[PDB]
Amino acid sequence: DAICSKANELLQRSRQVRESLKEYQKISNQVDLSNVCAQYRQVRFYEGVVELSLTAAEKKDPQGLGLHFYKHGEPEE
């Protein structure tokens, strides 16, 4: 929440103008990231953003739970 707001600000300062990028990496998580992502791109940060997205994906899951889900591929839990 508040942390998220801080993150947006973190990037926002970075929008104005390496360090802020790092600060973002620390914060990265969830849906708000979508909006935040557009911001990363503004200063041509495509490459870092992908690892960012990927790391986040792994961070929530750790780990390999989804793979099991696919194996069954069941609609059940």
mmCIF file of all heavy atoms in Angstrom, unseen atoms left out:
data_model
loop_
_atom_site.group_PDB
_atom_site.id
_atom_site.type_symbol
_atom_site.label_atom_id
_atom_site.label_comp_id
_atom_site.label_asym_id
_atom_site.label_seq_id
_atom_site.Cartn_x
_atom_site.Cartn_y
_atom_site.Cartn_z
ATOM 1 N N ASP A 1 0.850 -1.212 0.000
ATOM 2 C CA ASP A 1 0.000 0.000 0.000
ATOM 3 C C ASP A 1 0.855 1.221 0.000
ATOM 4 O O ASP A 1 1.181 1.766 -1.052
ATOM 5 C CB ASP A 1 -0.884 0.030 1.259
ATOM 6 N N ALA A 2 1.251 1.672 1.204
ATOM 7 C CA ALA A 2 2.069 2.842 1.322
ATOM 8 C C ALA A 2 3.347 2.548 0.616
ATOM 9 O O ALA A 2 3.900 3.395 -0.081
ATOM 10 C CB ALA A 2 2.408 3.192 2.778
ATOM 11 N N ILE A 3 3.842 1.308 0.769
ATOM 12 C CA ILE A 3 5.075 0.923 0.156
ATOM 13 C C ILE A 3 4.925 1.056 -1.326
ATOM 14 O O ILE A 3 5.830 1.531 -2.008
ATOM 15 C CB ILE A 3 5.468 -0.494 0.479
ATOM 16 N N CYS A 4 3.759 0.649 -1.864
ATOM 17 C CA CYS A 4 3.528 0.711 -3.277
ATOM 18 C C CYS A 4 3.574 2.145 -3.713
ATOM 19 O O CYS A 4 4.156 2.464 -4.749
ATOM 20 C CB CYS A 4 2.153 0.150 -3.678
ATOM 21 N N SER A 5 2.968 3.047 -2.920
ATOM 22 C CA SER A 5 2.924 4.435 -3.284
ATOM 23 C C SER A 5 4.323 4.944 -3.351
ATOM 24 O O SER A 5 4.667 5.739 -4.225
ATOM 25 C CB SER A 5 2.170 5.284 -2.246
ATOM 26 N N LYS A 6 5.181 4.487 -2.419
ATOM 27 C CA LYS A 6 6.543 4.924 -2.377
ATOM 28 C C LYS A 6 7.223 4.472 -3.631
ATOM 29 O O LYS A 6 8.003 5.210 -4.229
ATOM 30 C CB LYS A 6 7.305 4.332 -1.177
ATOM 31 N N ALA A 7 6.927 3.236 -4.070
ATOM 32 C CA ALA A 7 7.562 2.698 -5.239
ATOM 33 C C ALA A 7 7.206 3.544 -6.422
ATOM 34 O O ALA A 7 8.063 3.853 -7.247
ATOM 35 C CB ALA A 7 7.115 1.256 -5.544
ATOM 36 N N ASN A 8 5.932 3.965 -6.532
ATOM 37 C CA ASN A 8 5.539 4.728 -7.680
ATOM 38 C C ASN A 8 6.345 5.987 -7.678
ATOM 39 O O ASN A 8 6.807 6.445 -8.723
ATOM 40 C CB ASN A 8 4.053 5.128 -7.666
ATOM 41 N N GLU A 9 6.533 6.579 -6.485
ATOM 42 C CA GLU A 9 7.278 7.796 -6.364
ATOM 43 C C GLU A 9 8.700 7.524 -6.743
ATOM 44 O O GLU A 9 9.348 8.338 -7.401
ATOM 45 C CB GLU A 9 7.271 8.359 -4.930
ATOM 46 N N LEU A 10 9.208 6.341 -6.361
ATOM 47 C CA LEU A 10 10.573 5.969 -6.585
ATOM 48 C C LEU A 10 10.810 6.037 -8.059
ATOM 49 O O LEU A 10 11.800 6.615 -8.508
ATOM 50 C CB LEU A 10 10.784 4.512 -6.136
ATOM 51 N N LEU A 11 9.904 5.434 -8.849
ATOM 52 C CA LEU A 11 10.049 5.433 -10.275
ATOM 53 C C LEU A 11 9.806 6.828 -10.775
ATOM 54 O O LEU A 11 10.490 7.293 -11.682
ATOM 55 C CB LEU A 11 9.092 4.443 -10.981
ATOM 56 N N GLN A 12 8.854 7.556 -10.153
ATOM 57 C CA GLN A 12 8.456 8.852 -10.636
ATOM 58 C C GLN A 12 9.637 9.774 -10.645
ATOM 59 O O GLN A 12 9.811 10.549 -11.587
ATOM 60 C CB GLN A 12 7.352 9.496 -9.781
ATOM 61 N N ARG A 13 10.478 9.721 -9.602
ATOM 62 C CA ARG A 13 11.639 10.557 -9.570
ATOM 63 C C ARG A 13 12.484 10.158 -10.736
ATOM 64 O O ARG A 13 13.082 10.999 -11.408
ATOM 65 C CB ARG A 13 12.466 10.361 -8.287
ATOM 66 N N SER A 14 12.539 8.841 -11.005
ATOM 67 C CA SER A 14 13.299 8.285 -12.085
ATOM 68 C C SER A 14 12.691 8.726 -13.386
ATOM 69 O O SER A 14 13.362 8.739 -14.415
ATOM 70 C CB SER A 14 13.296 6.748 -12.088
ATOM 71 N N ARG A 15 11.386 9.057 -13.409
ATOM 72 C CA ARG A 15 10.824 9.507 -14.650
ATOM 73 C C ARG A 15 11.432 10.831 -14.988
ATOM 74 O O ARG A 15 11.779 11.098 -16.139
ATOM 75 C CB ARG A 15 9.298 9.693 -14.589
ATOM 76 N N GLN A 16 11.607 11.686 -13.965
ATOM 77 C CA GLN A 16 12.108 13.017 -14.140
ATOM 78 C C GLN A 16 13.482 12.912 -14.724
ATOM 79 O O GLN A 16 13.852 13.667 -15.625
ATOM 80 C CB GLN A 16 12.186 13.762 -12.795
ATOM 81 N N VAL A 17 14.261 11.937 -14.225
ATOM 82 C CA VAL A 17 15.610 11.666 -14.636
ATOM 83 C C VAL A 17 15.655 10.181 -14.677
ATOM 84 O O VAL A 17 15.412 9.588 -15.724
ATOM 85 C CB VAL A 17 16.644 12.012 -13.603
ATOM 86 N N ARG A 18 20.839 5.690 -12.719
ATOM 87 C CA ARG A 18 20.984 4.274 -12.577
ATOM 88 C C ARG A 18 20.302 3.850 -11.316
ATOM 89 O O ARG A 18 19.628 2.822 -11.265
ATOM 90 C CB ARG A 18 22.453 3.819 -12.483
ATOM 91 N N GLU A 19 20.452 4.685 -10.267
ATOM 92 C CA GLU A 19 20.052 4.376 -8.923
ATOM 93 C C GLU A 19 18.580 4.155 -8.792
ATOM 94 O O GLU A 19 18.161 3.198 -8.142
ATOM 95 C CB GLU A 19 20.436 5.491 -7.935
ATOM 96 N N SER A 20 17.745 5.005 -9.411
ATOM 97 C CA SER A 20 16.334 4.849 -9.211
ATOM 98 C C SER A 20 15.916 3.540 -9.797
ATOM 99 O O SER A 20 14.968 2.914 -9.323
ATOM 100 C CB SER A 20 15.495 5.940 -9.891
ATOM 101 N N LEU A 21 16.622 3.096 -10.851
ATOM 102 C CA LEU A 21 16.293 1.866 -11.509
ATOM 103 C C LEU A 21 16.472 0.770 -10.503
ATOM 104 O O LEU A 21 15.621 -0.106 -10.362
ATOM 105 C CB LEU A 21 17.233 1.627 -12.709
ATOM 106 N N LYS A 22 17.591 0.812 -9.752
ATOM 107 C CA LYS A 22 17.892 -0.197 -8.784
ATOM 108 C C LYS A 22 16.838 -0.185 -7.724
ATOM 109 O O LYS A 22 16.387 -1.232 -7.259
ATOM 110 C CB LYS A 22 19.238 0.052 -8.081
ATOM 111 N N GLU A 23 16.403 1.022 -7.322
ATOM 112 C CA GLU A 23 15.467 1.143 -6.249
ATOM 113 C C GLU A 23 14.192 0.484 -6.660
ATOM 114 O O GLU A 23 13.516 -0.142 -5.847
ATOM 115 C CB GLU A 23 15.202 2.612 -5.864
ATOM 116 N N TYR A 24 13.830 0.608 -7.946
ATOM 117 C CA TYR A 24 12.629 -0.002 -8.424
ATOM 118 C C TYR A 24 12.726 -1.495 -8.327
ATOM 119 O O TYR A 24 11.778 -2.164 -7.908
ATOM 120 C CB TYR A 24 12.296 0.337 -9.879
ATOM 121 N N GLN A 25 13.898 -2.054 -8.683
ATOM 122 C CA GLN A 25 14.063 -3.477 -8.739
ATOM 123 C C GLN A 25 13.719 -4.027 -7.396
ATOM 124 O O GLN A 25 13.048 -5.052 -7.273
ATOM 125 C CB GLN A 25 15.519 -3.871 -9.070
ATOM 126 N N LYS A 26 14.151 -3.331 -6.340
ATOM 127 C CA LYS A 26 13.896 -3.801 -5.014
ATOM 128 C C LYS A 26 12.412 -3.882 -4.770
ATOM 129 O O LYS A 26 11.914 -4.882 -4.251
ATOM 130 C CB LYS A 26 14.520 -2.840 -3.980
ATOM 131 N N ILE A 27 11.659 -2.840 -5.156
ATOM 132 C CA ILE A 27 10.254 -2.727 -4.863
ATOM 133 C C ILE A 27 9.348 -3.690 -5.636
ATOM 134 O O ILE A 27 8.414 -4.244 -5.068
ATOM 135 C CB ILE A 27 9.813 -1.288 -4.930
ATOM 136 N N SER A 28 9.660 -3.950 -6.924
ATOM 137 C CA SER A 28 8.848 -4.661 -7.888
ATOM 138 C C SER A 28 7.980 -5.749 -7.320
ATOM 139 O O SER A 28 8.442 -6.622 -6.603
ATOM 140 C CB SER A 28 9.709 -5.347 -8.965
ATOM 141 N N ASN A 29 6.661 -5.662 -7.662
ATOM 142 C CA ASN A 29 5.639 -6.635 -7.387
ATOM 143 C C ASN A 29 4.297 -6.168 -7.916
ATOM 144 O O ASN A 29 4.000 -4.978 -7.968
ATOM 145 C CB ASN A 29 5.479 -7.036 -5.904
ATOM 146 N N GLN A 30 3.466 -7.155 -8.333
ATOM 147 C CA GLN A 30 2.092 -7.095 -8.787
ATOM 148 C C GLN A 30 1.696 -6.124 -9.850
ATOM 149 O O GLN A 30 2.499 -5.540 -10.573
ATOM 150 C CB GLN A 30 1.019 -7.066 -7.689
ATOM 151 N N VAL A 31 0.353 -5.977 -9.923
ATOM 152 C CA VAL A 31 -0.448 -5.312 -10.916
ATOM 153 C C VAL A 31 -0.081 -3.869 -11.041
ATOM 154 O O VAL A 31 -0.078 -3.327 -12.144
ATOM 155 C CB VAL A 31 -1.919 -5.341 -10.601
ATOM 156 N N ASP A 32 0.219 -3.198 -9.930
ATOM 157 C CA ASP A 32 0.555 -1.811 -10.043
ATOM 158 C C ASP A 32 1.778 -1.749 -10.889
ATOM 159 O O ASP A 32 2.044 -0.735 -11.531
ATOM 160 C CB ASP A 32 0.859 -1.124 -8.709
ATOM 161 N N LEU A 33 2.549 -2.848 -10.937
ATOM 162 C CA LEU A 33 3.745 -2.842 -11.724
ATOM 163 C C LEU A 33 3.399 -2.547 -13.141
ATOM 164 O O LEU A 33 4.240 -2.009 -13.860
ATOM 165 C CB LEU A 33 4.534 -4.151 -11.751
ATOM 166 N N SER A 34 2.194 -2.915 -13.612
ATOM 167 C CA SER A 34 1.881 -2.688 -14.998
ATOM 168 C C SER A 34 2.042 -1.233 -15.310
ATOM 169 O O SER A 34 2.736 -0.871 -16.256
ATOM 170 C CB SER A 34 0.434 -3.067 -15.365
ATOM 171 N N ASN A 35 1.427 -0.355 -14.498
ATOM 172 C CA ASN A 35 1.505 1.058 -14.760
ATOM 173 C C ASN A 35 2.933 1.471 -14.662
ATOM 174 O O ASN A 35 3.445 2.234 -15.481
ATOM 175 C CB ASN A 35 0.752 1.908 -13.723
ATOM 176 N N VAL A 36 3.610 0.931 -13.641
ATOM 177 C CA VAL A 36 4.948 1.292 -13.298
ATOM 178 C C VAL A 36 5.858 0.931 -14.447
ATOM 179 O O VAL A 36 6.844 1.617 -14.699
ATOM 180 C CB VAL A 36 5.378 0.604 -12.032
ATOM 181 N N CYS A 37 5.536 -0.164 -15.175
ATOM 182 C CA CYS A 37 6.348 -0.672 -16.252
ATOM 183 C C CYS A 37 6.434 0.327 -17.348
ATOM 184 O O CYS A 37 7.509 0.554 -17.903
ATOM 185 C CB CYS A 37 5.830 -1.995 -16.853
ATOM 186 N N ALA A 38 5.306 0.988 -17.660
ATOM 187 C CA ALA A 38 5.291 1.914 -18.752
ATOM 188 C C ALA A 38 6.313 2.954 -18.445
ATOM 189 O O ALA A 38 7.011 3.445 -19.332
ATOM 190 C CB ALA A 38 3.939 2.625 -18.916
ATOM 191 N N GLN A 39 6.417 3.311 -17.154
ATOM 192 C CA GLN A 39 7.348 4.297 -16.699
ATOM 193 C C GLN A 39 8.760 3.819 -16.890
ATOM 194 O O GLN A 39 9.628 4.612 -17.253
ATOM 195 C CB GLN A 39 7.141 4.663 -15.218
ATOM 196 N N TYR A 40 9.051 2.510 -16.670
ATOM 197 C CA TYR A 40 10.428 2.088 -16.763
ATOM 198 C C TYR A 40 10.845 2.288 -18.185
ATOM 199 O O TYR A 40 11.966 2.716 -18.453
ATOM 200 C CB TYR A 40 10.757 0.595 -16.508
ATOM 201 N N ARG A 41 9.931 1.981 -19.129
ATOM 202 C CA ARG A 41 10.189 1.976 -20.548
ATOM 203 C C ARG A 41 10.580 3.334 -21.017
ATOM 204 O O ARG A 41 11.359 3.453 -21.962
ATOM 205 C CB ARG A 41 8.972 1.623 -21.423
ATOM 206 N N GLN A 42 10.050 4.384 -20.369
ATOM 207 C CA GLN A 42 10.236 5.720 -20.847
ATOM 208 C C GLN A 42 11.694 5.978 -20.995
ATOM 209 O O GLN A 42 12.110 6.583 -21.979
ATOM 210 C CB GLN A 42 9.635 6.772 -19.905
ATOM 211 N N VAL A 43 12.527 5.519 -20.048
ATOM 212 C CA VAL A 43 13.918 5.765 -20.300
ATOM 213 C C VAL A 43 14.525 4.475 -20.782
ATOM 214 O O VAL A 43 15.486 3.959 -20.207
ATOM 215 C CB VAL A 43 14.655 6.234 -19.072
ATOM 216 N N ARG A 44 13.945 3.917 -21.867
ATOM 217 C CA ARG A 44 14.431 2.774 -22.592
ATOM 218 C C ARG A 44 14.968 1.712 -21.680
ATOM 219 O O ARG A 44 16.128 1.323 -21.801
ATOM 220 C CB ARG A 44 15.489 3.145 -23.643
ATOM 221 N N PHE A 45 14.148 1.207 -20.738
ATOM 222 C CA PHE A 45 14.636 0.190 -19.854
ATOM 223 C C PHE A 45 13.901 -1.083 -20.156
ATOM 224 O O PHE A 45 13.281 -1.691 -19.287
ATOM 225 C CB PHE A 45 14.386 0.584 -18.383
ATOM 226 N N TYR A 46 13.961 -1.541 -21.417
ATOM 227 C CA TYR A 46 13.266 -2.741 -21.780
ATOM 228 C C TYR A 46 13.904 -3.971 -21.208
ATOM 229 O O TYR A 46 13.231 -4.799 -20.598
ATOM 230 C CB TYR A 46 13.154 -2.914 -23.304
ATOM 231 N N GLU A 47 15.233 -4.098 -21.356
ATOM 232 C CA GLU A 47 15.905 -5.317 -21.008
ATOM 233 C C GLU A 47 15.750 -5.585 -19.543
ATOM 234 O O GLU A 47 15.399 -6.684 -19.129
ATOM 235 C CB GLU A 47 17.410 -5.215 -21.264
ATOM 236 N N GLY A 48 16.006 -4.569 -18.713
ATOM 237 C CA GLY A 48 15.944 -4.772 -17.299
ATOM 238 C C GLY A 48 14.541 -5.072 -16.904
ATOM 239 O O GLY A 48 14.309 -5.819 -15.955
ATOM 240 N N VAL A 49 13.564 -4.453 -17.589
ATOM 241 C CA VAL A 49 12.204 -4.670 -17.199
ATOM 242 C C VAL A 49 11.836 -6.120 -17.349
ATOM 243 O O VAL A 49 11.111 -6.651 -16.511
ATOM 244 C CB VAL A 49 11.195 -3.862 -17.959
ATOM 245 N N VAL A 50 12.293 -6.810 -18.412
ATOM 246 C CA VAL A 50 11.864 -8.180 -18.551
ATOM 247 C C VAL A 50 12.343 -9.033 -17.418
ATOM 248 O O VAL A 50 11.570 -9.808 -16.858
ATOM 249 C CB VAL A 50 12.310 -8.851 -19.810
ATOM 250 N N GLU A 51 13.628 -8.917 -17.038
ATOM 251 C CA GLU A 51 14.133 -9.740 -15.976
ATOM 252 C C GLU A 51 13.320 -9.416 -14.773
ATOM 253 O O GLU A 51 13.018 -10.274 -13.943
ATOM 254 C CB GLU A 51 15.597 -9.441 -15.624
ATOM 255 N N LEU A 52 12.938 -8.138 -14.665
ATOM 256 C CA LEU A 52 12.157 -7.673 -13.565
ATOM 257 C C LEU A 52 10.871 -8.442 -13.510
ATOM 258 O O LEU A 52 10.501 -8.986 -12.468
ATOM 259 C CB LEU A 52 11.725 -6.229 -13.796
ATOM 260 N N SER A 53 10.164 -8.526 -14.648
ATOM 261 C CA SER A 53 8.876 -9.155 -14.654
ATOM 262 C C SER A 53 9.042 -10.594 -14.316
ATOM 263 O O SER A 53 8.264 -11.154 -13.548
ATOM 264 C CB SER A 53 8.180 -9.083 -16.027
ATOM 265 N N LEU A 54 10.083 -11.223 -14.892
ATOM 266 C CA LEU A 54 10.313 -12.628 -14.707
ATOM 267 C C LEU A 54 10.649 -12.908 -13.275
ATOM 268 O O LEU A 54 10.119 -13.841 -12.676
ATOM 269 C CB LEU A 54 11.458 -13.113 -15.602
ATOM 270 N N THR A 55 11.523 -12.087 -12.671
ATOM 271 C CA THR A 55 11.930 -12.361 -11.328
ATOM 272 C C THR A 55 10.723 -12.296 -10.456
ATOM 273 O O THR A 55 10.555 -13.109 -9.548
ATOM 274 C CB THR A 55 12.959 -11.394 -10.807
ATOM 275 N N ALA A 56 9.839 -11.321 -10.728
ATOM 276 C CA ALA A 56 8.663 -11.153 -9.931
ATOM 277 C C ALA A 56 7.817 -12.378 -10.043
ATOM 278 O O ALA A 56 7.262 -12.847 -9.052
ATOM 279 C CB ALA A 56 7.805 -9.959 -10.381
ATOM 280 N N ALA A 57 7.705 -12.943 -11.261
ATOM 281 C CA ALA A 57 6.849 -14.074 -11.452
ATOM 282 C C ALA A 57 7.344 -15.187 -10.584
ATOM 283 O O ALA A 57 6.557 -15.884 -9.949
ATOM 284 C CB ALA A 57 6.841 -14.580 -12.904
ATOM 285 N N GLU A 58 8.672 -15.379 -10.548
ATOM 286 C CA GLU A 58 9.263 -16.428 -9.773
ATOM 287 C C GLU A 58 9.107 -16.149 -8.305
ATOM 288 O O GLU A 58 8.928 -17.071 -7.516
ATOM 289 C CB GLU A 58 10.754 -16.639 -10.095
ATOM 290 N N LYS A 59 9.170 -14.861 -7.903
ATOM 291 C CA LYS A 59 9.130 -14.483 -6.511
ATOM 292 C C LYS A 59 7.840 -14.876 -5.858
ATOM 293 O O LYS A 59 7.827 -15.219 -4.678
ATOM 294 C CB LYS A 59 9.264 -12.971 -6.261
ATOM 295 N N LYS A 60 6.706 -14.738 -6.565
ATOM 296 C CA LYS A 60 5.439 -15.078 -5.979
ATOM 297 C C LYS A 60 5.270 -16.560 -5.817
ATOM 298 O O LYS A 60 4.863 -17.040 -4.760
ATOM 299 C CB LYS A 60 4.255 -14.511 -6.787
ATOM 300 N N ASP A 61 5.618 -17.325 -6.869
ATOM 301 C CA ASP A 61 5.457 -18.756 -6.975
ATOM 302 C C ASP A 61 6.405 -19.618 -6.178
ATOM 303 O O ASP A 61 5.963 -20.717 -5.853
ATOM 304 C CB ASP A 61 5.554 -19.246 -8.429
ATOM 305 N N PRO A 62 7.625 -19.221 -5.826
ATOM 306 C CA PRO A 62 8.653 -20.152 -5.420
ATOM 307 C C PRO A 62 8.250 -21.301 -4.565
ATOM 308 O O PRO A 62 7.934 -21.122 -3.391
ATOM 309 C CB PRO A 62 9.749 -19.340 -4.742
ATOM 310 N N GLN A 63 8.268 -22.492 -5.192
ATOM 311 C CA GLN A 63 8.583 -22.432 -6.588
ATOM 312 C C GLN A 63 8.114 -23.683 -7.259
ATOM 313 O O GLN A 63 8.054 -24.751 -6.651
ATOM 314 C CB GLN A 63 10.089 -22.318 -6.884
ATOM 315 N N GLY A 64 7.740 -23.556 -8.548
ATOM 316 C CA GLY A 64 7.412 -24.686 -9.365
ATOM 317 C C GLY A 64 6.045 -25.216 -9.057
ATOM 318 O O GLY A 64 5.717 -26.331 -9.454
ATOM 319 N N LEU A 65 5.214 -24.455 -8.320
ATOM 320 C CA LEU A 65 3.895 -24.936 -8.019
ATOM 321 C C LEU A 65 3.064 -24.989 -9.265
ATOM 322 O O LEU A 65 2.344 -25.954 -9.503
ATOM 323 C CB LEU A 65 3.153 -24.075 -6.985
ATOM 324 N N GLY A 66 3.173 -23.951 -10.115
ATOM 325 C CA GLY A 66 2.353 -23.843 -11.289
ATOM 326 C C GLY A 66 2.606 -25.008 -12.188
ATOM 327 O O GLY A 66 1.690 -25.514 -12.833
ATOM 328 N N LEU A 67 3.867 -25.471 -12.249
ATOM 329 C CA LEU A 67 4.223 -26.532 -13.145
ATOM 330 C C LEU A 67 3.385 -27.721 -12.795
ATOM 331 O O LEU A 67 2.912 -28.432 -13.682
ATOM 332 C CB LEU A 67 5.721 -26.897 -13.027
ATOM 333 N N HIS A 68 3.184 -27.980 -11.489
ATOM 334 C CA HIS A 68 2.409 -29.110 -11.068
ATOM 335 C C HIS A 68 0.992 -28.937 -11.515
ATOM 336 O O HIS A 68 0.357 -29.883 -11.975
ATOM 337 C CB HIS A 68 2.405 -29.287 -9.541
ATOM 338 N N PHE A 69 0.474 -27.699 -11.419
ATOM 339 C CA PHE A 69 -0.886 -27.387 -11.757
ATOM 340 C C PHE A 69 -1.129 -27.750 -13.185
ATOM 341 O O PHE A 69 -2.163 -28.329 -13.518
ATOM 342 C CB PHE A 69 -1.165 -25.880 -11.588
ATOM 343 N N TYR A 70 -0.177 -27.417 -14.070
ATOM 344 C CA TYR A 70 -0.308 -27.673 -15.474
ATOM 345 C C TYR A 70 -0.345 -29.148 -15.714
ATOM 346 O O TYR A 70 -1.122 -29.624 -16.539
ATOM 347 C CB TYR A 70 0.868 -27.086 -16.274
ATOM 348 N N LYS A 71 0.485 -29.913 -14.978
ATOM 349 C CA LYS A 71 0.596 -31.327 -15.204
ATOM 350 C C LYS A 71 -0.769 -31.924 -15.101
ATOM 351 O O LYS A 71 -1.204 -32.642 -15.999
ATOM 352 C CB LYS A 71 1.471 -31.999 -14.132
ATOM 353 N N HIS A 72 -1.489 -31.643 -13.999
ATOM 354 C CA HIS A 72 -2.822 -32.143 -13.900
ATOM 355 C C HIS A 72 -3.645 -31.412 -14.911
ATOM 356 O O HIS A 72 -4.396 -32.013 -15.677
ATOM 357 C CB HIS A 72 -3.438 -31.921 -12.509
ATOM 358 N N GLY A 73 -3.498 -30.073 -14.942
ATOM 359 C CA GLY A 73 -4.208 -29.257 -15.882
ATOM 360 C C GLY A 73 -5.649 -29.263 -15.483
ATOM 361 O O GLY A 73 -6.521 -28.952 -16.294
ATOM 362 N N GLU A 74 -5.936 -29.625 -14.218
ATOM 363 C CA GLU A 74 -7.298 -29.715 -13.777
ATOM 364 C C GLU A 74 -7.835 -28.358 -13.449
ATOM 365 O O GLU A 74 -7.105 -27.433 -13.089
ATOM 366 C CB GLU A 74 -7.499 -30.610 -12.540
ATOM 367 N N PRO A 75 -9.122 -28.236 -13.657
ATOM 368 C CA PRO A 75 -9.862 -27.050 -13.316
ATOM 369 C C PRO A 75 -10.040 -26.955 -11.835
ATOM 370 O O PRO A 75 -10.347 -25.871 -11.341
ATOM 371 C CB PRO A 75 -11.179 -27.133 -14.091
ATOM 372 N N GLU A 76 -9.864 -28.079 -11.118
ATOM 373 C CA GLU A 76 -10.008 -28.093 -9.692
ATOM 374 C C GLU A 76 -8.835 -27.346 -9.165
ATOM 375 O O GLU A 76 -7.979 -26.910 -9.935
ATOM 376 C CB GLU A 76 -9.992 -29.509 -9.087
ATOM 377 N N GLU A 77 -8.778 -27.166 -7.830
ATOM 378 C CA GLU A 77 -7.723 -26.411 -7.230
ATOM 379 C C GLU A 77 -6.448 -27.024 -7.685
ATOM 380 O O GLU A 77 -5.547 -26.297 -8.108
ATOM 381 C CB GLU A 77 -7.733 -26.492 -5.695
#
